[PDB]
Design a protein around this nucleic acid. Structure first.
Ligand SMILES: [Ca+2]
Ligand SMILES: [Ca+2]
Length: 542
DNA sequence: GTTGGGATTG
DNA sequence: GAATGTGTGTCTCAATCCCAACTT
DNA sequence: TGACACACATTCAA
């Protein structure tokens, strides 16, 4: 509904300029030649090229290329044919033709070799691939097919550019029009004109290779040839080693699901990924090598990766000490968790077990809310908003940031320690209550990692602000900062407020067929050692 | 005719 | 009865087409 | 496009 018909080409020329000035030193010979050559195309053909780069395929029937802004599809496509950037009569493997053509058209083309039953499209290919392994020009499948198919052949450079400008490959160019329409509305940070996503080109190239390995894997191919291509020595850049170490982790998971534990051990062991060490032990155990398992677990319990790894090691060590001759480690006492049982009539009809306990528990002198990590994450997101989106160098390179780029980075707290000391300071004097309504009214709806506007109504915001102790908020917000990925979930299903007694209690509801998860248990027990009001409500039916 | 999942699209 | 492995649904931007599968 | 929580199945060491 915005004016201009060509906005998407304005936006693409826009990103070409931005990579021209910000990434100038990072471009190559072949690449900088592309940005130059692109600017010389007619407006009609530059527009078509942006359409194909923005749609799903690398392959298109001329028929699917109808656009009003560009009059003729065939006319606009010639200057692109000249650079070899768009192929006509490209080569299509059997499977790819099944994408381009309807089942009607495919039925006739292979009309000979389908006699058996009329059957599905996914099924045809299964029975039709052994007959047609080879790939052919579109002309060599049916010689008279008069509709071109186009293959955009320069797409690799475009993803390299998209990756450099955005700094993660999941965001589309559609980020532009959505922001303009006011659909996804982002916070605007003012960062330096020299700040950018990637420093070295070898950083871009490495990200791109890891992305290639999961692409080739989520299709597959064996890892046996993939781990040939991955580096066997850690990456220079920390964020890359983050990405690589995670990739290794997920490959090892796929191994474990195929019951290949001897390889699973080798893979987990060379990933630094969270809980990788644990899956390594549990993998060795699954593969019946108990001797190595026990030694790894003993090594881990000495300086454990996390409270969650402590929590799992507290199960693995004694079982291993069981299948080995060793004396068991008597596990710890737990403070216990405040039990509440409810016998409720049947659904009918569902209506989750959680919602039902919310209506049951409301006194009405009691108010009860369904918020899962919504309320603590959100209050934190509001209070520390000015610290989170603080303009720290290399934390923002574009307009579309939903969270700082350094968010999971280990020293992220330390770099902002100023504004965090200030925002966390508002708990010590009274100023947090007003400050949170201030960031809340001003910043409502803006995309942020922690703030669930959907969840946070006026009633819940001010009920929580006056029933939640300043000091308990200090505790939870400090714990949240200790491991951002590892502590932002586990929180309970419900929180209830008694505003007259300015009390609250958080309640986890477990229907039959759920137990308390490990991270949930950490959250409950952390509160319970701090003498915070949490409780677990287990429901039975009758 | 209906679903229902996808792409596409501003 | 724990403790595991493993499968499923919910978020969605919303509106519109275009197909493939099912149901009449 | 995952991250989360839940639901259900399987396999064990008390
Ligand atoms: Ca829940
Ligand atoms: Ca629950």
């Amino acid at each position: 509904a915005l004016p201009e018909p060509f906005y998407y080409l304005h936006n693409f020329r826009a990103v070409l300029a931005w990579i021209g000035e910000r990434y100038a030193d990072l471009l190559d010979d072949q690449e900088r030649a592309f940005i130059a050559a692109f600017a010389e195309l007619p407006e009609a053909s530059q527009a078509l090229l942006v359409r194909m780069v923005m749609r799903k395929g690398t392959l298109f029937r001329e028929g699917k290329l109808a656009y009003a802004e560009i009059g003729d599809t065939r006319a606009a496509v010639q200057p692109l044919l000249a650079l070899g950037w768009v192929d006509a009569q490209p080569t299509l493997e059997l499977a790819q033709l099944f994408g381009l053509l309807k089942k009607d058209e495919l039925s006739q083309l292979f009309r000979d070799h389908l006699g058996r039953a009329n059957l599905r499209k996914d099924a045809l290919l299964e029975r039709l691939q052994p007959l047609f392994p080879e790939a052919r020009r579109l002309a060599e499948w049916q010689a008279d097919f008069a509709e071109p198919v186009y293959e955009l052949r320069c797409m690799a450079l475009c993803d390299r550019l998209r990756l450099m400008y955005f700094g993660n490959l999941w965001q589309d160019w559609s980020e532009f029009v959505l922001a303009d329409l006011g659909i996804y509305r982002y916070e605007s940070v003012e960062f330096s004109a020299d700040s950018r996503g990637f420093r070295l080109r070898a950083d871009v190239d490495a990200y791109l290779h890891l992305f290639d390995c999961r692409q080739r894997f989520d299709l597959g191919e064996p890892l046996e040839e993939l781990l040939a291509g991955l580096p066997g020595e850690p990456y220079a850049n920390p964020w890359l080693e983050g990405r690589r170490v995670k990739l290794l982790f997920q490959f090892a998971q796929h191994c474990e699901k195929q019951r290949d534990f001897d390889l699973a051990q080798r893979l987990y062991r060379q990933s630094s990924h969270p809980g990788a060490r644990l899956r390594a032990i549990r993998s060795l155990e699954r593969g019946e090598r108990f001797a190595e398992a026990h030694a790894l677990a003993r090594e881990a319990s000495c300086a454990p990766e996390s409270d969650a790894e402590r929590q799992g090691l507290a199960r693995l060590l004694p079982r291993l000490q069981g299948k080995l001759g060793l004396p068991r480690q008597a596990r710890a006492a737990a403070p216990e968790i405040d039990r509440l049982d409810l016998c409720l009539a049947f659904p009918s009809e569902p209506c989750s077990v959680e919602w039902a306990v919310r209506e049951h528990l409301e006194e009405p002198g009691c108010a009860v809310h369904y918020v899962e990590n919504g309320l603590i994450n959100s209050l934190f997101g509001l209070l520390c908003w000015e610290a989170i989106f603080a303009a720290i160098p290399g934390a923002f390179f574009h307009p579309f940031h939903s969270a700082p780029a350094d968010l999971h980075s280990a020293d992220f707290r330390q770099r902002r320690a100023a504004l965090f000391e200030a925002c966390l300071g508002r708990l010590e004097d009274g100023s947090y209550r007003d400050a949170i309504r201030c960031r809340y009214r001003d910043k409502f709806g803006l995309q942020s990692p922690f703030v669930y506007w959907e969840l946070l109504g006026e009633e819940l915001l001010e009920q929580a602000l006056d029933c939640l102790p300043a000091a308990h908020l200090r505790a939870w917000f400090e714990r949240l900062l200790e491991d951002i990925p590892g502590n932002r979930a586990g929180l309970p299903d419900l929180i209830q407020f008694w505003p007259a007694q300015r009390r609250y209690r958080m309640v986890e509801v477990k229907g039959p067929g759920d137990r308390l998860q490990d991270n949930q248990l950490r959250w409950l027990q952390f509160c319970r050692e701090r003498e915070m009001p949490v409780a677990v409500c287990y429901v039975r039916w009758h």
